[PDB]
């Protein structure tokens, strides 16, 4: 993993990964990460920004797992 791309993620230019922008990131990664490694690696993968649309699914996912992980159901929520 790496957050080098955070310098570009924070451009906030769309939730999608942008062309050129992502390349500036990968370029910089090579500059700050031996390309020799990256010349063997299956691929560099870039994450989508978590737009509110993403959040609208994530929150439910996380609240559900978070609750499920709370020991035993002696209480828990109805979650309205």
């Amino acid at each position: 993993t790496s957050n080098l791309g955070a310098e570009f993620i924070n451009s906030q230019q769309g939730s999608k990964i942008q062309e050129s922008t992502k390349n500036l990131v990968m370029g910089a990664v090579r500059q700050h990460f031996r390309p020799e490694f990256l010349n063997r690696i299956s691929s560099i993968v870039i994450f989508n920004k978590l737009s509110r649309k993403a959040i609208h699914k994530i929150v439910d996912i996380r609240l559900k797992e978070i609750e499920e992980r709370f020991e035993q159901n002696d209480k828990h929520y109805k979650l309205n």
Binding site: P35, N39, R40, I41, S42, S43
Partner: protein, 65 residues
Amino acid sequence: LTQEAKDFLAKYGYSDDMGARPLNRLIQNEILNKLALRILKNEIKDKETVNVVLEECLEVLPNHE
């Protein structure tokens, strides 16, 4: 591979600082992973081809051929 698949790999990947390994990675990432999926989906039961689609893609034997 014809001239074209070979050219797609060369043209898409031939940076002068790359090493041949990225071409090899490219084909694995470009086609072979697609093949793996085609196999898993039974799009490829036996045999296989090469086809060039401009960008690139991989043909199937959709009848589980």
